[PDB]
Chain A
Amino acid sequence: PSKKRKRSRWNQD
């Protein structure tokens, strides 16, 4: 399972 730690898809700032 990939796509776990590379591009944050739940940021805010």
Chain B
Amino acid sequence: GHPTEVLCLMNMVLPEELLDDEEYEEIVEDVRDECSKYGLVKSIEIPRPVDGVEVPGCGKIFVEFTSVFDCQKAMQGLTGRKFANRVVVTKYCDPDSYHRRDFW
């Protein structure tokens, strides 16, 4: 593909899950501690439709990485795994689009 800066995490989050306080804290926390195993992760952006406020677009989340070096060694080990019962589709995302949440 092409390394940019931030990592992408798709096919591992549903709108029916990113609506609960328990499920949310569970994903953000876990995904964080995990992403911080291959390198350094600045932050994490995971939509949270307010009672269905951001549903039209919900389903894709990711984390803001520091370097593409660890971002590569990370996604290379996250691809093929399983968030729970579905193959996780990790990719690369541009820090710019991330900031604006343009979703890439």
Contacts and interface: CB of A to CB of B under 8 A. Distances in A.
Interface in A1-13: 1-4, 7, 9-12
Contacts, number: 27
A12 B29 CA distance: 21
Chain A binding surface, main DSSP class: loop
A2 B84 CA distance: 19
Interface residues of B, number: 14
Nearest to B12: A9
Nearest to A1: B33
A7 B23 CA distance: 14
Contact of A12 (B30, B33, B80): B80
Interface of A: 1-4, 7, 9-12
